[PDB]
Symmetry: D2
């Protein structure tokens, strides 16, 4: 029953880059109107905005409610954000279908948004420290990148699956360069032009327009790639090269009944045939998507070889390949235009982000079956099946 | 169709009182373990833990997840947090209901959690602070009570309702007195012994058992009530003891299909018949419960008559009164055992907390159709109709 | 030549005690007036104020000046601070002495002030930390109690002397209790009333007048002292019981020439016949007083044995004995009224605080030759010889 | 009978510029070795180091001791810092001169050093912040630039001298340009070569040698000053332009007896013939240089017109005029090589920065009498007289 009317994301910006001082709900707003106008639908009629956000400290009350009211959504709608780490971005889009598919609502916007750049450092000083140094905790490292279960960064969870699947530094770096090259090819030709909405960086030295993914490294050689030190495990494997950095962006989708889109002349971007989510051992968290995807395909009714296009989050090359190897889809059909390693993440958005890449790329090549999938810190994964109407 | 087999709520703590130094997820697990034990269900068979949480600042990746693990819920079940302010904790239950109702999960735990105590101060300190003074922001006040739509603390959006509803200082006081009598009474007669589930505050020179709501004051006399000068408006009428204060508390209810509960020989508290969330003019946020209720009642097919028991978020004297004056339910069945004023508030779990009381009162007095409803910052209501078997 | 006409000091306050919210220049100011009053010189005849202060962060431009002004010193006069750690309050009396000596001033008020309670926490936030955690530093510990060369605490340099001069846990505790008991006594016999000037802690609910050193323990048992665990070297011998506290307080002297004193018919507290400062190995910093006092005595022309009364700074019991055995004066003329371990240790003021004790017990019993000496972090010591007139 | 046998200064640095991350004492060290090695004196003969400094917060125990110990001054010699604001650097030379006069030392190294870039933000937190937001004070602004009595700026007191002395917006800007242009010439012709000592800013990606005052602006237009808006009082007369900025640096000079120099065969940069300091009205704080300069000259037995060369602090344009119109000397001989608006200032060190400039230009142009003078915040002033040998 449930279709994706419209789809949009901002361009993804570098850490402390273009959007360094741009608040998440602001990037949220932009994309909220974007999917409004591209479905041809008026915020007047939006029932609820569901935004995944991971790092919300300091942005004031309920940043879902701000991004919506800003982008025109009237007061009679409702707004709530949510968090599943990387999954947030896509799971919102699942959550949103469950609203229409239960009679509980007619029309929803969903996705996520994220300013890793605007994340505050923090301290609980209600008691007041009478004597001693204290740590100013960086919520982006803490709430965003740090396993609450072992003590190490995500980067180690990668190393445990590296050693597990025995993914060598030569192969891992090979994966990286591919994703840089792919995404740089994809960029030059306007293969991202469709889904992107420009964002207007309100300024004072003038206004400056952003409609390019500033994280893709042009010319990225297998050698520049091989001159790196392992960013975590000092003779482990994971480097900056073959691992996503820290970024900002948003991405959303307007959902409605197949019967409703029909009434309005809207030519949907797809229809959500199924979604799933599963949990695993936090030490090896990147193995989320394997169980996650296959749950989806049981619910969707498809077999793995039915898939025309995959967009599987390359959080870290190591786990990216772990998903690829084990599942065994046609590798040349995953991240055709590039993975996270090259475009970045912005966590809270990373899933609606790749949903955008997926969808517009289905639309443009007559692919009919696709699936977005991502891994999760804590040890989980999410998946979604999209079949084009 | 879907029922609530069990529930449990921690006793609600005072601000920087009994749970002063306690991480909400650790209150979380306690409530989770509880709903299981009582109802007879084993950790493994839980699919997912959906938890409301407004001030997760600094706590670590997916705190819902951290609660989950700590209560025994296996590495496979999923967990996520979400936010719609005070309405998070009831709304989380509806989102639990929808997991069952669509084809996605057998057994969900839904609730909410909140440690107003551990809430940090913070500043954005990435691009450095070149030169000048800067502010450390209180995230409890920033992200919890400061509607980032006008400038001021919730307290005067309460004033904004009194103003039109002319609710004189003596009626605002007389509300509190009543609630504080009704609540303290309830407890004395033992009525919170059912809902609550003891928690352990793990001190150094000994452990501490908490299962008494420390916020409840005694001998609630109109006399003391009427001398607190206007807290929020320097020429106002909503005061600290007639606006719900800052509190710590977790609370939750276990969910499964009605057939599943019987298959499991588990004596449900009641059945989730309908729910509702609606928007209203943000300035006058307190009125959420007015439009939400109708819808819920309408969806349930009940007119107010059929309600034998009700709970409405006593956020303020200013907003709770108008609500009963508008909808026109009979007061004699609303917050019988007490409301936010006397019990406490605690954002992320308030809605879940009032879930518990309603259900446990329903059992031990013979109401068949209870309803709960809440106001939300930014202009929102959330509503649920409950039928017992 | 140059002589001390009058003196005063405040009570010494405990850490976050009677002066917790009382800025140091406020304490210094009372002292300035006192020494003015007590001599019969008018605030307007003061040429310059010299005040050692070690923790001045947060306080404002030249707090020395602030005190001078609040005490009523004309703005035609000058005021500056200096920092030689513990020796500050006494070097200051010497620099003051130099002013008059060379004939570039006539009437100096000199001493020191400190508020260890009022120290702030800080961090250099201009460049900003792009990501990861930074510490908020205690300026008190950092700038006030810690050697930057070998990087350990000022407490550790006590373990050095402890190990090196072979002082038992017992005999250090003995010293501590001796110091307690002596002070305690001198308090009850009223021997501090003369040196001490009251201070009015202004209060929202009422003034409080502080007139007694509140750090001194009454009936302190050896048992109490002997059960504390070693405060720095967890495998050591120094503790919080035989180590001076963290204290607030000020103290000062009014200097002029001997000739000028006579014109005014002032009966001075004694004559500065010499001073000195030396350096020693930073690791055992407590040792300063050895060659300092040597230097000072030789400059004066005095055989150690000619001393009638001595004050030596008890940084820790460890250096205090070390200073004693090595120099060898009869310990029955040393710290006749207790020492820093009992009375307190307001860093900047300490060197003036002992000078006061010395000056007042000197006169009270009519001693001809006296010596004050302190030990200093970054391996130094300062000593001045006073003779009565 | 006391002389300056050499001097040296680092290049003065831009705020957050060349030295943005150099601990002040590191700059001191360089200056120390420098004066030793330009005089034929070995660090081991140094008796004491006396270094002015206003913003040491965060820098750990006694920064001036760290400076001396890095420079190799023996641990047997002593060290202290001091704070009479802008006067610090020069007063320090005068105190160093005092120590020798009285026969308490043979060789002092005295001057100043400052690092406004490494000044920290801070707040007082032992009390306990119960709730609500709070400030993080900038110690530089709070502790270096703000008159503690009226609570405005050092730039606002500058507006006072404007009205009271009648200096138009355009009258002052031209003076500022004059300075800049005087200073751009002097640099180019290498007139700063003698005094400046290169400092190596040890760098992870290579070392970098700073050997030129980077604050100076080439091709200074009178326009670009005149363009500037009032920065201390919305509708005032002062601007960020005709006012001195914020800077890092250090400077010092080595002192000894005249006959001592004689033995050693040292051709001395000059002879201290006298000095003085005074206080003036705190609101016209910049008017300090007036009576100090006078009382200096009178002490030296000199007429203002006997002076061959003059260096007067350009803390602002406004005082600079005020001081020149009052004292009444040939302004052709004032700051002959530019002044502090263009060379920047760096409070603690300023005083010796001009001393260096005075001694070296006196030498190169064969001047036989000189004068150094600077205005002090809080309401003071220090001037010293030099006569060449």
């Amino acid at each position: 029953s449930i279709v994706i009317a419209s789809a949009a994301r901002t361009a993804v910006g570098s850490f402390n880059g273009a959007f360094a001082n741009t608040p998440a709900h602001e990037l949220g707003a932009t994309v909220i109107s974007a999917v409004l106008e591209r479905a041809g639908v008026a915020a007047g009629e939006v029932n609820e905005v569901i935004l995944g956000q991971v790092l919300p400290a300091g942005e004031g009350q309920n940043p879902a409610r701000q991004a919506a009211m800003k982008a025109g959504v009237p007061q009679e709608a409702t707004a709530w954000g949510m968090n599943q780490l990387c999954g947030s971005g896509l799971r919102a889009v699942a959550l949103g279908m469950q609203q229409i598919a239960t009679g509980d609502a007619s029309i929803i916007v969903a996705g996520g948004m994220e300013s890793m750049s605007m994340a505050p450092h923090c301290a609980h000083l209600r008691g007041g420290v009478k004597m001693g140094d204290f740590k100013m905790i960086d919520t982006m490292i803490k709430d965003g990148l740090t396993d609450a279960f072992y003590g190490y960064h995500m980067g180690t969870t990668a190393e445990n699956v590296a050693k597990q699947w025995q993914l060598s530094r030569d192969e891992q770096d090979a994966f990286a360069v591919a994703s840089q090259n792919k995404a740089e090819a994809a960029q030059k030709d306007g293969r991202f032009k469709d889904e992107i909405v420009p964002f207007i960086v309100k300024g004072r030295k003038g206004d400056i327009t952003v409609d390019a993914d500033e994280y893709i490294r042009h010319g990225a050689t297998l050698d520049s790639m091989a001159k790196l030190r392992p960013a975590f495990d000092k003779e482990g494997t994971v480097t900056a090269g073959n691992a996503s950095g820290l970024n900002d962006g948003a991405a959303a989708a307007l959902l409605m009944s197949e019967a409703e889109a029909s009434r309005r002349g809207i030519q949907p971007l797809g229809r959500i045939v199924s979604w799933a989510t599963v949990g695993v051992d936090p030490k090896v968290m990147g193995t989320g998507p394997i169980p996650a995807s296959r749950k989806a395909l049981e619910r969707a009714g498809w077999k793995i070889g039915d898939l025309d296009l995959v967009e599987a989050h390359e959080a870290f090359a190591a786990q990216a390949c772990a998903v690829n190897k084990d599942l065994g889809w046609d590798p040349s059909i995953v991240n055709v235009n590039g993975g996270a390693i090259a475009i970045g993440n912005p966590i809270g958005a990373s899933g609606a982000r790749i949903l955008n890449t997926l969808l517009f790329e289905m639309k443009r090549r007559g692919a009919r079956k696709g699936l977005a999938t991502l891994c999760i810190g804590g040890g989980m994964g999410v998946a979604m099946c999209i079949e084009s109407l």
